Amino acid sequence: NPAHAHFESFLQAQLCQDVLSSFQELCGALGLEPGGGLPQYHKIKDQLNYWSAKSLWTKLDKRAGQPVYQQGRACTSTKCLVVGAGPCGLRVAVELALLGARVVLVEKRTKFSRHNVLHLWPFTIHDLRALGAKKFYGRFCTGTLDHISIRQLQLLLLKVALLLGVEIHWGVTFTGLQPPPRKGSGWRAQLQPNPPAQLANYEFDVLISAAGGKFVPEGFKVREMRGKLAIGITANFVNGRTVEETQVPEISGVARIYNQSFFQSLLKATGIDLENIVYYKDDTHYFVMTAKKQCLLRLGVLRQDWPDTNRLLGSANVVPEALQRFTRAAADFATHGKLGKLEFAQDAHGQPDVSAFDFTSMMRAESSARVQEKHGARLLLGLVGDCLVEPFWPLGTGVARGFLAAFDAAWMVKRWAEGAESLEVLAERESLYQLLSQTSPENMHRNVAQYGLDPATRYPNLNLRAVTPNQVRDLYDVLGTQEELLRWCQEQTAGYPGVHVSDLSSSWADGLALCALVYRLQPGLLEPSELQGLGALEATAWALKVAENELGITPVVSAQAVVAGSDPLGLIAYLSHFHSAFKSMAHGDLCALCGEHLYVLERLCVNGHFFHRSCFRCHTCEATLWPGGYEQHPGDGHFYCLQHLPLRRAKEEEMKRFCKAQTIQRRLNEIEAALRELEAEGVKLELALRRQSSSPEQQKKLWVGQLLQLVDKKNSLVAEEAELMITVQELNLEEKQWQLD
Ligand SMILES: Cc1cc2nc3c(=O)[nH]c(=O)nc-3n(C[C@H](O)[C@H](O)[C@H](O)COP(=O)(O)OP(=O)(O)OC[C@H]3O[C@@H](n4cnc5c(N)ncnc54)[C@H](O)[C@@H]3O)c2cc1C
Numbered sequence: 001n002p003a004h005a006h007f008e009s010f011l012q013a014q015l016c017q018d019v020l021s022s023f024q025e026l027c028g029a030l031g032l033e034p035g036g037g038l039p040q041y042h043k044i045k046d047q048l049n050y051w052s053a054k055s056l057w058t059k060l061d062k063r064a065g066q067p068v069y070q071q072g073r074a075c076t077s078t079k080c081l082v083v084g085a086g087p088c089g090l091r092v093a094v095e096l097a098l099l100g101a102r103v104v105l106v107e108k109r110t111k112f113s114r115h116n117v118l119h120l121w122p123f124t125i126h127d128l129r130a131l132g133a134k135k136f137y138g139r140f141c142t143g144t145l146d147h148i149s150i151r152q153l154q155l156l157l158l159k160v161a162l163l164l165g166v167e168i169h170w171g172v173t174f175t176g177l178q179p180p181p182r183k184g185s186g187w188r189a190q191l192q193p194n195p196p197a198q199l200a201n202y203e204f205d206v207l208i209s210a211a212g213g214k215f216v217p218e219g220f221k222v223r224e225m226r227g228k229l230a231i232g233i234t235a236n237f238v239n240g241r242t243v244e245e246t247q248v249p250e251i252s253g254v255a256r257i258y259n260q261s262f263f264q265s266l267l268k269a270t271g272i273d274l275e276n277i278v279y280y281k282d283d284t285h286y287f288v289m290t291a292k293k294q295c296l297l298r299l300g301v302l303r304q305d306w307p308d309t310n311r312l313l314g315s316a317n318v319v320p321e322a323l324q325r326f327t328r329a330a331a332d333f334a335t336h337g338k339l340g341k342l343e344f345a346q347d348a349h350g351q352p353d354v355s356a357f358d359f360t361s362m363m364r365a366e367s368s369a370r371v372q373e374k375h376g377a378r379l380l381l382g383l384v385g386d387c388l389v390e391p392f393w394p395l396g397t398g399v400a401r402g403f404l405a406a407f408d409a410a411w412m413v414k415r416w417a418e419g420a421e422s423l424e425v426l427a428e429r430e431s432l433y434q435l436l437s438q439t440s441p442e443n444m445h446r447n448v449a450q451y452g453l454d455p456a457t458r459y460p461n462l463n464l465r466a467v468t469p470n471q472v473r474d475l476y477d478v479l480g481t482q483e484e485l486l487r488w489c490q491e492q493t494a495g496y497p498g499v500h501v502s503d504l505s506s507s508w509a510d511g512l513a514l515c516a517l518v519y520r521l522q523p524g525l526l527e528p529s530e531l532q533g534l535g536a537l538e539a540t541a542w543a544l545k546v547a548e549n550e551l552g553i554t555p556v557v558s559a560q561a562v563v564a565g566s567d568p569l570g571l572i573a574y575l576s577h578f579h580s581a582f583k584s585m586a587h588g589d590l591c592a593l594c595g596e597h598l599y600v601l602e603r604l605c606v607n608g609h610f611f612h613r614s615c616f617r618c619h620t621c622e623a624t625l626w627p628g629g630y631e632q633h634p635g636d637g638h639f640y641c642l643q644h645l646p647l648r649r650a651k652e653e654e655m656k657r658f659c660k661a662q663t664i665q666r667r668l669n670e671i672e673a674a675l676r677e678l679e680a681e682g683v684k685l686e687l688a689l690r691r692q693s694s695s696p697e698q699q700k701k702l703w704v705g706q707l708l709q710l711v712d713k714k715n716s717l718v719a720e721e722a723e724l725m726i727t728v729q730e731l732n733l734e735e736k737q738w739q740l741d
Pocket residue numbers: 083084085086087088089106107108109116117118119172173174175210211212213215288385386387393394395396397398399402
């Protein structure tokens with residue numbers, strides 16, 4: 001059989017174009033009518049008598065015999081379409097095909113020319129070799145290697161899927177869904193430029209999308225997650241597979257808190273600042289980095305200081321030659337020269353493999369499902385992979401998250417196909433989406449040899465009813481705090497002579513109100529006899545000091561403006577501190593380092609002195625100085641920090657500590673972005689709130705209302721990152737003990 005001859009040409013291919021040629025040859029021939037559908041598989045093991053293939057069939061049988069498989073009669077009438085052929089899209093197509101639906105895939109690209117590396121969770125490893133992954137790549141999961149290139153996995157899963165009768169039209173660009181003409185008709189899809197007829201009229205009632213990060217489908221809004229600007233570089237080197245490079249240890253990567261010693265060493269060697277570097281020794285060596293803009297400008301890698309991240313990535317703007325030099329230097333300095341000679345990776349384009357990319361902003365989807373019904377037709381929309389959850393690249397969570405999304409989509413579509421209505425399925429999928437953001441090898445089951453599609457075996461104790469049906473009516477489509485703060489103040493005033501509370505401000509400048517407040521904050525702090533023995537300036541200084549000593553709450557107002565009383569908003573915030581402190585348990589005005597008045601959104605006191613928040617940085621390393629790691633020089637008043645003052649479980653815990661450190665750093669970047677945005681908003685609002693301090697009483701109450709809302713939000717957050725920072729010093733601490741070990 002010439003058809004069977006091209007079958008071994010197929011199953012023995014190593015390049016994508018060869019797979020395409022074999023498929024096209026079978027398309028021209030009429031030997032077996034390739035890819036006609038699922039039943040092909042049930043006849044395909046018949047006319048094959050090579051012993052070496054047994055395991056393949058065996059494994060697929062052991063994968064096609066689960067009761068959850070319904071023996072293939074699950075959703076037979078149903079008909080589907082997958083846009084996107086990454087690992088996630090291939091998993092969606094193949095798994096949805098297994099249960100029996102008609103499956104077609106489309107791709108604008110036609111050649112497997114992505115040569116970078118991907119990281120896989122253990123469940124991804126087991127589920128990936130469940131499809132007989134041994135056959136298509138010899139070195140798969142060989143020992144401790146747990147990292148597979150994009151094209152390798154792409155080819156493996158594509159060959160597996162093509163053994164299971166999936167239909168593909170390459171060179172096809174998705175651009176929308178054609179509305180039904182009339183009653184009883186389903187949804188067609190717009191594809192370009194000119195797909196063949198057999199798909200052009202192929203009509204479907206299910207669509208699961210894996211378009212990736214750059215494309216999201218109709219009917220979904222997008223949210224942006226942003227941080228401080230950071231650019232990254234991806235580099236590759238064609239490996240000679242030599243022993244000298246093979247014996248090289250694989251540094252798991254470097255993060256700012258994670259290897260401060262490594263940054264110090266690389267600065268001493270060559271004075272180069274990075275933010276993150278990770279090194280992968282697969283077939284072609286992978287180097288992923290992110291770093292600091294002015295260190296990157298130091299070598300001139302950029303010519304013009306363009307704020308726009310994508311346009312900063314502009315090739316005309318980017319100095320490529322400097323990029324190659326910097327990549328080479330970063331590599332050979334990171335690996336400590338035992339690589340010896342290095343040669344650039346020859347890409348598909350015809351050049352070295354280097355590129356400049358983004359590590360800051362990520363798209364996100366609030367909703368992972370949409371059932372749209374028209375002309376008596378129920379249509380389902382779901383997202384799998386990066387289109388739903390676009391991750392931080394190097395965390396390596398993309399493939400695992402996409403495969404979890406694939407299982408979610410398969411389960412939910414098979415549930416809806418059985419006549420189940422919209423409410424329960426959308427509720428279930430939103431219930432799993434609420435947990436998807438915290439997927440982790442940690443919160444997964446400890447042993448992995450019994451997984452599948454059933455959501456009960458993947459999320460222990462899943463409250464599937466997390467979202468009531470009535471919440472998704474939108475997802476179905478057919479055609480003055482000052483009053484309450486004051487009231488709390490009176491509640492803290494019961495039985496006090498000489499304390500005549502009338503507003504938020506005038507009743508506190510007396511001074512004894514501070515003592516009464518701290519009294520009922522915690523009983524036994526002071527004897528009642530001495531209550532009438534303090535002076536007003538002394539009383540307010542004492543109250544501030546005791547509040548910092550007992551609760552450690554941040555002062556907002558100094559004693560001079562207290563007795564002056566002309567800036568009540570600070571005292572409002574200061575009382576608001578305790579207003580939020582008991583919400584459950586009890587139910588020189590300028591700056592020199594910033595040359596500006598401490599405008600309240602950035603006004604802060606530095607151990608009994610008055611400077612801005614932004615100006616508080618180390619002159620050497622221009623970082624934020626948190627308690628336990630800095631100490632002020634009294635000679636000049638400048639602010640300086642400390643150094644700146646002139647076996648399987650082993651690798652498992654190493655990876656876990658890397659991931660947790662990086663997560664901490666990313667969280668700090670997120671908080672910094674949030675603080676900058678909120679302080680800009682507060683600046684623009686307080687412009688009026690100070691200038692236009694004569695609004696209507698309702699307007700004045702509203703302004704101060706969100707002023708309090710915002711300041712209380714900062715209080716809660718700064719507490720949260722205070723505890724996170726404390727986690728940082730303690731993690732450095734047992735790093736010191738581990739070095740001591
Ligand atoms: C250049 C690059 C480098 C990357 N490097 C890394 C890395 O080092 N580490 C890492 O963990 N992750 C990396 N990723 C992301 C990686 O894709 C995911 O993190 C993970 O591999 C999940 O892969 P995926 O299935 O999301 O691929 P996808 O993003 O789903 O692949 C995009 C797919 O959508 C298809 N598509 C898009 N538009 C259309 C259309 N109109 N019609 C038909 N098909 C369409 C594309 O052709 C392609 O098949 C990288 C991504 C890119 C683009």
